[PDB]
Amino acid sequence: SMDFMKPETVLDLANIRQALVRMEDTIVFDLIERSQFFSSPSVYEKNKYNIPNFDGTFLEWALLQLEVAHSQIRRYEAPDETPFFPDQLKTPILPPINYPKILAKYSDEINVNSEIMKFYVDEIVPQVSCGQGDQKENLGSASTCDIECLQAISRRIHFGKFVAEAKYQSDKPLYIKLILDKDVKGIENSITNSAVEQKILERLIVKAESYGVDPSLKQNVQSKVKPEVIAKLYKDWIIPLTKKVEIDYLLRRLEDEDVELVEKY
Template structure:
């Protein structure tokens, strides 16, 4: 079984914090632009989906052809995607799950992301619909990558640290006890604090009359209320579907 380094996994997750912050900064340079999310207002003849839904679907169709979703942490928001055209050789995975999509939290990520926009985007309509949904897609994919990477790899590492405990909790189906075992409150507090400070530091030299500034507290709360809980939910799903040795 391939070794996993918790320090390396934590470093990857920490690096994704900056990615998410930068993607959100890019999105909030445009207003909320509500028509982007309204069905039937995409401007595509005969389409009932919103412009955002179409942009996400077409992006993921292309991504699927190039093999993006062959990677465990890249889970699609869209169903019925084309199979990959690219042949990809993977090293032996340390994960023990028959289907990566058994851990797919994208529908819940999407709901919380759209709610976040109301807090961080300037209100109103500037007409930049294409740019708005383009940056939505990039931000969503970064957030999803962070959540699913943690779900798979942190879940596997925690299991290996105390397999007997997790086998016992899984055998009795004690969901609350499993979530408690997966929780590291002091680590969660550290992450939320670090994200808040990063958002402030990254924007320290932003010229606010020209550039919209990201609400650092809103991002920290999004981590605390969405990213961290959904990561743990993903860890739980992973453990529930984990194949025995």
């Protein structure tokens, strides 16, 4: 029932988990589409193409163009959108959506898109690609799929901000105590549910099978993305980084609280 014009429907743990489940499908679809192309080392080589006045990889350059264009139509006014190039965005040409306040004022500074870009290129691309290879005529196709994947993974991971804020407002006296202690381990314990995480991993295995296998053949019955690769993407990267976002958000949460935490400290 998530409605970003109604904060109470966004800061609802049941609505949040339902959206997270739906994001599993989105991410799996995007990886399956990226599995159409080879490892494509040229996409991720720094300045392989001497694009004038630009420094970086081809993927970074194509991502920068999309981000710049999407900033013109307010994509990063949304609280569930976190840009990879926050300093290079331009003023939108459409008037503001004017979202209600949901997250604390500093929330845009919680940005781990650099670590996402790093593990996506170094760990995921080699594992979801259909093979090792570099086809010049698929430079653009592969990098567009990369962008789709990168933006779905970044949305999922930075959704931890909504998880953290909803958890904060359900139990302010506990979290005020933890934040003033800087009890990083305590914060992690308060947000972690290992049993739920294992059941996410198991549902991902079945989604990779059901979405990644053509349902017309039962003679070449392999999934076009390895299910354990999908499960490992969450276990090793997406879930730990979501918690880092949540922890970093809470550690600064008293910056945007009334000094009536003198009551609870």
